[model samples]
Target: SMEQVAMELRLTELTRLLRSVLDQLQDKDPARIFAQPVSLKEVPDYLDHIKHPMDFATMRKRLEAQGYKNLHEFEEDFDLIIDNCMKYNARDTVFYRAAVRLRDQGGVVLRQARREVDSIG
Candidate 1:
């Protein structure tokens, strides 16, 4: 229960950080060269596809099993997603950057959670 609580707290913080990052990015460039005109409210939904810690843990385990030594090894997958988002709409690049930030933050949370889990076991 404590572990779960800790995980939830970290997740909430991650979400807050993500929202702040998105808002700041929007504020810095209200009309980014390729970004569509969108309000800050629309940012969260854009990153809805990012995986949670549990999901990322599972994916990381699988990737490790496949001999992937580093997260950067998955760059192609990330790039593909970013490219697809841009293809769908140039404005989607904003969403793409948001998703990237979410994933980066998620990785930190996931790594910390994994260390905790390993220590507990």
Candidate 2:
């Protein structure tokens, strides 16, 4: 029997892992502001402090285009997203704390990915 909807894309081990993290980030992110890169329009010095800007949307593009080469590389980009957030925002702000919440979960996500990877292969 044909499945209701079969999977079309076959993501790599790291790609799938990275995508999982990107997917979970939105629910915890208010307005999904973290969905896209911190725009220069909103933040005056976005180009200054955030030397390397990153976000889930951009990561999705990179993932689909086969841009990331390794797990650590993708992980660094993920880290950079939060780094950009926390570095630019100070305490008493929801964005900063929101970034913290995801950062805290990133490790858990990574740990699960590793375990799942090992279990599979």
Best by lDDT: 2
Q: What residue pairs are clashing in model 2?
A: none
- How far residue 46's Cα lies from its native spot in candidate 1, in Å, is 17
lDDT of 1 by residue, 1-121 (tens): 9998987665555444433433433344333422342233765554454332122233334443443323344334434434544444445456556555545544555455446434643
What would you estimate as the lDDT of candidate 1?
Answer: 0.42
Across 1-121, the per-residue lDDT of candidate 2 in tens digits comes to 2342222232365567667756765566656768887777878777988788999888889987767765667778888888888988896798888888887866777677667655754
Q: Candidate 1 vs. truth: CA RMSD?
A: 12.4
Query: CA lDDT, every prediction?
Result: 0.42, 0.74
Instruction: Tell me how many clashing residue pairs each candidate has.
Output: 1, 0
| TM of each candidate vs. truth | 0.30, 0.77
Off by over 4 Å in 1: 32-121
